[PDB]
């Protein structure tokens, strides 16, 4: 599996899912990227940029290979959203209030040519931005939401408007559709999800969509909606500014139950507690705040220079050594109680500065165990006579399989626990191993 992201710059980042690190940062040749999409055969990534350009990127070489293929015919307005018809056409909604169809068919004279343009009903007071377009295969149509709240269904072949709805009271940020194109769902700033349907045979014959229902389930705006259907799965997953994830059913959207996931599920923890010194240590992005409890006081607050978020932190049983581990570097601090506060000093360990830290634990006040992002496990004595090499720990090799090929991170050490000389590692696949250090 390959994962690509755009983050408000000119660069598409392809991720290394084994380590969770940027495998490649490919700078698209023109402008700040607003939209990303992939074609049906998954060979090409189309990115729609701030200066009006749409750029095709051949990713068919393999994981880590991205190449510039074609820049389609340019325009003046920002391409806010993108979609594909087969491998043949690219549809893009723009900020001038209109939807454009480009031909991406090679071996044709129309290649890269802007075939069609269709203007949505503008807002009288202000601008109109087409925030989302999706393509419906079964009924050859384009579904669009704009800033006025209107959902429009367009005949693709003639590039005309079949049907229009004034459903939302605000922006329509996101759209989705089911597998058979029987249902189309829309959401935006209005905080309601709207279901439009063609489920009945008369509606399928007449190609007429019906504003079937709406549901108010989010406290703030909705930025993303997506849907999945299989034999064991039928659900619609949505999220936005409320920072919480809501799960609905697709076929039973109006009737069936929904679940709001907790905003924070601490699978990876950002708070530790030191029993001996009665301390609570919490680390946000570049900040480590420590409280004493006896009644609660903020004894120290550490602000770190590096831009990477702190992945983990570990505090010594006596409370002196604090190891702050990022996927970039790892830094060690000595904390000395000076009055109410603690004076913090930084100890320079070259191995830890060069070492990416996934998981870190302590044997004692001196020795630590680190599982790196490269899955290697080793032991550092910290204070020592000289700067000797850290002790490497032998590990069994997990047998590669179909899931290990497909999802890359499962054959990597996920949990690490230690007590005295015994340690336990567990992989993502479910393998548990005991290390006698």
């Amino acid at each position: 599996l390959r994962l690509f992201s755009i983050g408000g710059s000119t660069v598409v980042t392809e991720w290394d899912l084994a380590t969770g690190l940027p495998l490649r940062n490919y700078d698209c040749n023109s402008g700040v990227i607003w939209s990303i999409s992939i074609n049906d055969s998954q060979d090409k990534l189309s990115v729609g940029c701030d200066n009006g350009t749409v750029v095709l990127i051949d990713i068919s070489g393999g994981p880590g290979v991205l190449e510039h293929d074609t820049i389609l015919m340019r325009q003046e307005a920002r391409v806010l959203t993108l979609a594909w018809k087969k491998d043949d056409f690219v549809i893009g909604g723009c900020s001038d209030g209109r939807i454009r169809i480009w031909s991406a068919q090679k071996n044709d004279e129309n290649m890269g040519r802007l075939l069609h343009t269709m203007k949505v009903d503008k807002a009288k007071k202000e601008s109109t931005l087409v925030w989302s377009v999706i393509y419906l295969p079964r009924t050859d149509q384009i579904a669009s939401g704009d800033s006025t709240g209107s959902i429009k269904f367009w005949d693709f072949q003639f590039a005309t408007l079949n049907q229009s709805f004034k459903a939302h009271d605000a922006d329509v940020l996101c759209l989705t559709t089911d597998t058979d194109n029987n249902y189309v769902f829309s959401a935006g700033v209005d905080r309601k999800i709207f279901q439009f349907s063609q489920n009945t045979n008369k509606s399928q014959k007449n190609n007429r969509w019906v504003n079937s229902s709406n549901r108010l389930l989010h406290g703030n705006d909705i930025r993303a909606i997506c849907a999945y259907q299989s034999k064991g799965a039928d659900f619609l997953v949505s999220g936005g500014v409320e920072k919480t994830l809501v799960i609905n059913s697709l076929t039973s959207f109006s009737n069936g139950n929904y679940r709001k996931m907790p905003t924070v599920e601490p699978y990876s923890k950002n708070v530790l507690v030191n029993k001996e010194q009665r301390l609570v240590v919490s680390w946000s992005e570049s900040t480590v705040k420590i409280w004493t409890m006896g009644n609660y006081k903020l004894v120290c607050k550490l602000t770190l220079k590096d831009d990477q978020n702190i992945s983990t932190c570990s505090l010594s049983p006596d409370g002196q050594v604090l190891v702050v581990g990022r996927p970039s570097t790892t830094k060690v601090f000595h904390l000395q109680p000076v009055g109410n506060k603690l004076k913090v000093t930084k100890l320079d360990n070259d191995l830890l500065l060069r070492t990416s830290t996934k998981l870190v634990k302590f044997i004692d006040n001196s020795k630590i165990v680190i599982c790196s992002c490269e899955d290697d496990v080793f032991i550092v004595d910290l204070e020592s006579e000289e700067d000797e090499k850290p002790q490497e720990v032998e590990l069994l090799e997990v047998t590669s399989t179909k899931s290990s090929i497909k999802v890359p991170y499962i054959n990597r050490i996920n949990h690490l626990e230690v007590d005295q000389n015994i340690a336990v590692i567990s992989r993502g696949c479910g393998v548990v191993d005991i290390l006698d250090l």
Partner: protein
């Protein structure tokens, strides 16, 4: 009478007198490849036009180290009409070799016609996205100059420099921001292209915007680091 002053870079001279100009020695005496002026001091010098071409627009702007010396072999990418290529040939003299690559046929005819009389120019009529096609003609080169006005200039220079350029050789690229995003300040586009070159492997040494000669154009000079 006029005086010939040796410029910092080798093979480049400055005429001094009532009127001052930038000049190069003429390989073929008594002939002008285009409508440039000739000064006879004997030895004959052709006059550069920094408004017409971008390389010694960079020289007049004061580039530190040009990577173009009379001993060196240069790969010129984007050689339309051979007008700047004739002066690069004059700089590299008879010993040096300039491989001038051009895609379009209409400047291709006149590039061939000028390389007919100029011996050290090896003309290539072939698209620059594909370095593997003209790999027979090229050996190793000391420097790579780029004048293509394309969005993927960094990719083209990467492909050519990985394949033909020696270690510690030079890359000199002319960047226009209009063939890139062009709706932001040109400095942003120039920073993006420098970062792209760093990603490719070219470690940049300097950058020089070409006012008043060109608008929103820069010359980025860097060194190839194969290691």
């Amino acid at each position: 009478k006029v005086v010939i002053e040796p410029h910092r870079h080798a093979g480049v001279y400055i005429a001094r007198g009532k009127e001052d100009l930038l000049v190069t020695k003429n390989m073929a005496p008594g002939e002008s490849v285009y409508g440039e002026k000739r000064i006879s001091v004997k030895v004959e010098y052709r006059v550069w036009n920094p408004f017409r071409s971008k390389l010694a627009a960079g020289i007049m702007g004061g580039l530190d180290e040009l990577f173009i010396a009379p001993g060196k072999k240069v790969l010129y990418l984007g050689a339309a009409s051979g007008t700047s290529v004739s002066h690069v040939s004059d700089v590299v003299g008879p010993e040096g070799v300039v491989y001038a690559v051009e895609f379009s046929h209409r400047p291709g005819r006149e590039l061939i016609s000028m390389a007919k009389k100029r011996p050290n120019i090896i003309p290539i009529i072939e698209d620059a996205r594909h370095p593997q096609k003209y790999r027979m003609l090229i050996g190793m080169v000391d420097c790579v100059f780029a004048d293509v006005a394309q969005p993927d200039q960094a990719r083209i220079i990467a492909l050519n420099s990985h394949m033909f350029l020696k270690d510690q050789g030079g890359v000199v690229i002319s960047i226009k921001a209009n063939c890139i995003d062009s709706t932001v300040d040109a400095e942003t586009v120039f920073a993006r292209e420098v970062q792209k070159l760093r990603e490719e492997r070219i470690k940049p040494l300097e950058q020089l915007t070409l006012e008043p000669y060109e608008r929103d154009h820069c010359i980025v000079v860097g060194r190839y680091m194969r290691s």
